Design an enzyme around this catalytic site. Structure first.
Site, PDB file in Angstrom:
ATOM      1  N   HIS A 153      17.915  -4.185  27.523  1.00 34.98           N
ATOM      2  CA  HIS A 153      17.853  -4.675  26.139  1.00 34.98           C
ATOM      3  C   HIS A 153      18.478  -6.010  25.862  1.00 34.98           C
ATOM      4  O   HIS A 153      18.210  -6.598  24.829  1.00 34.98           O
ATOM      5  CB  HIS A 153      18.379  -3.618  25.160  1.00 34.98           C
ATOM      6  CG  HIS A 153      17.288  -2.787  24.512  1.00 34.98           C
ATOM      7  ND1 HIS A 153      16.178  -2.366  25.188  1.00 34.98           N
ATOM      8  CD2 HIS A 153      17.168  -2.285  23.211  1.00 34.98           C
ATOM      9  CE1 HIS A 153      15.384  -1.648  24.360  1.00 34.98           C
ATOM     10  NE2 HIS A 153      15.993  -1.593  23.150  1.00 34.98           N
ATOM     11  N   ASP A 368      -3.607  -0.289  26.499  1.00 39.06           N
ATOM     12  CA  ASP A 368      -4.867   0.103  27.141  1.00 39.06           C
ATOM     13  C   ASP A 368      -5.195  -0.919  28.214  1.00 39.06           C
ATOM     14  O   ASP A 368      -5.407  -2.092  27.896  1.00 39.06           O
ATOM     15  CB  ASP A 368      -5.992   0.126  26.097  1.00 39.06           C
ATOM     16  CG  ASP A 368      -7.346   0.617  26.665  1.00 39.06           C
ATOM     17  OD1 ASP A 368      -7.536   0.695  27.912  1.00 39.06           O
ATOM     18  OD2 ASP A 368      -8.244   0.936  25.839  1.00 39.06           O
TER      19      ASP A 368
END
Length: 421
Positions: A153, A368
């Site tokens: 992070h 995707d």
């Protein structure tokens, strides 16, 4: 269920990238000091080249040209502050096979079983020695696939990581990156000199007292019914589904935990500063813009009032989170001596206290790669009790799902209370 590593590459950008020493803001330094894990699962499409690694690897390398910091490493600065060396050492891509199948993970509850599906990072050699982002494509027995993401992070928050994952999956589909990343964290620099305005409750130690992980599916009409309870006990102020759900979860956990009547309880809420800072940040701002709202109440009033009381406390906390509030946060953090010593942890969310983050407005199913959207995306395994996530349905049913982390004993109860809508 055995899982074997077959290939493991350190993938670098598909061409030269600017060497840069990239500063972190306070909010880029108050981070979960490991890799935040996500998982995606994908159904087989029948396609003979389903999740081809050459295709994935090429696209990741290309993706890494606009998002070059992602190939970087932590380095300590001269005053000794963590920055990002953009040195283009690269991202770790692991190809692994499992002897089992995708459905052996079931409802995809974020048990630490899922942790097998994100590459495990060794922290023992110093800040500079591990990838900022690690990735595992896992291939199962019946053609199922999973993608595990561990992202450090100090590089970016979940908002930006998603922006990187999606970009990458678009490059894997020969599509052009629609939103260039903007890369400069000094927009979140503290004022000179720092002059905070509030106590900044979020960073205080929480109230003190006096593991099982499950997921729970809530239908659109169930959520809808809950929103209506805003209208109970003669209250006109009407609250959002989010507000009514998060405060339903809060009461439920509290109730389930059999907290004292007089017992104080504090709820942590992740908050995207992006929409609210002034002047607002460039579209595609790369890094952390996550602040925290932290409502507090008495376990008794959360329990003995209607659900809208809880929701109200949440609403109020989030309302307060404007530019002037966020600016002050950045200032407050500047004055603090040890920022590292100020991050969340198991200790934070131990009973009585709780954390709820919602993913419902994030593009978690947009990943995707040419073979369809995920059947599920979720956190890559919760560590310890106190945490829950609100997850948008990947289906068209308009439902939402609550993954939560409680003690074995409390869970059985929490489920019981949650569906008492």
């Amino acid at each position: 269920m055995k899982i074997e590593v077959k290939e493991s590459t350190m993938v670098r950008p598909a061409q030269e990238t600017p060497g840069r020493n990239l500063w972190n803001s306070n909010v880029d330094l108050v981070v979960p000091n490991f890799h935040t894990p996500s998982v995606y699962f994908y159904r087989p499409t029948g396609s003979s080249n389903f999740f081809d690694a050459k295709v994935l690897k090429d696209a990741l390398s290309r993706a890494l040209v606009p998002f070059y910091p992602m190939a970087g490493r932590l380095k300590r600065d001269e005053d000794g502050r963590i920055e990002i060396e953009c040195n283009g050492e690269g991202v770790l891509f692991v190809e692994a096979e499992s002897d089992g199948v995708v459905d052996d993970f079931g409802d995809f509850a974020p048990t630490l079983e899922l942790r097998r599906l994100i590459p495990a990072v060794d922290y023992s050699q110093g800040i500079s020695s591990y990838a900022l982002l690690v990735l595992q494509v896992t291939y199962f027995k019946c053609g199922g696939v999973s993608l595990g993401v561990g992202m450090r992070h100090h590089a970016a928050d979940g908002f930006s990581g998603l922006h990187f994952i999606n970009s990458w999956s678009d490059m894997a589909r020969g599509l052009d990156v629609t939103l260039p990343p903007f890369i400069d964290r000094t927009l979140l620099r503290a004022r000179d000199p720092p002059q905070p305005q509030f106590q900044h409750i979020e960073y205080q130690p929480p109230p003190a007292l006096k593991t099982a992980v499950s997921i729970f599916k809530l239908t659109r009409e169930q959520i809808s019914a809950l929103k209506a309870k805003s209208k109970e006990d003669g209250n006109t102020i009407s609250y959002s589904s989010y507000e009514m759900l998060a405060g339903h979860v809060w009461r439920c956990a509290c109730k389930a935990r059999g907290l004292e009547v007089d017992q104080g309880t504090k709820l942590y809420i992740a908050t995207d500063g992006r929409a609210r800072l002034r002047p607002s940040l460039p579209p595609g701002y790369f890094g952390n813009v996550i602040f925290t709202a932290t409502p507090i109440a008495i376990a008794g009033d959360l329990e003995f009032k209607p659900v809208w009381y809880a929701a109200s406390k949440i609403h109020d906390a989030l309302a307060r989170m404007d530019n002037d509030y966020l600016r002050s946060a950045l200032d407050y953090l500047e004055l603090q001596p040890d920022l590292k010593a100020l991050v969340r942890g198991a200790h934070t969310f131990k009973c009585p206290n709780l954390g709820i983050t919602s993913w419902v407005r994030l593009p978690i199913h947009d990943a995707d790669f040419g073979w369809g959207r995920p059947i599920f995306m979720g956190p890559g395994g919760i560590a310890y009790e106190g945490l829950s996530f609100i997850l948008p349905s990947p289906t068209n049913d308009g439902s939402m799902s609550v993954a939560i982390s409680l003690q074995g004993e409390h869970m059985k109860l929490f489920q019981s209370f949650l569906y008492d809508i």
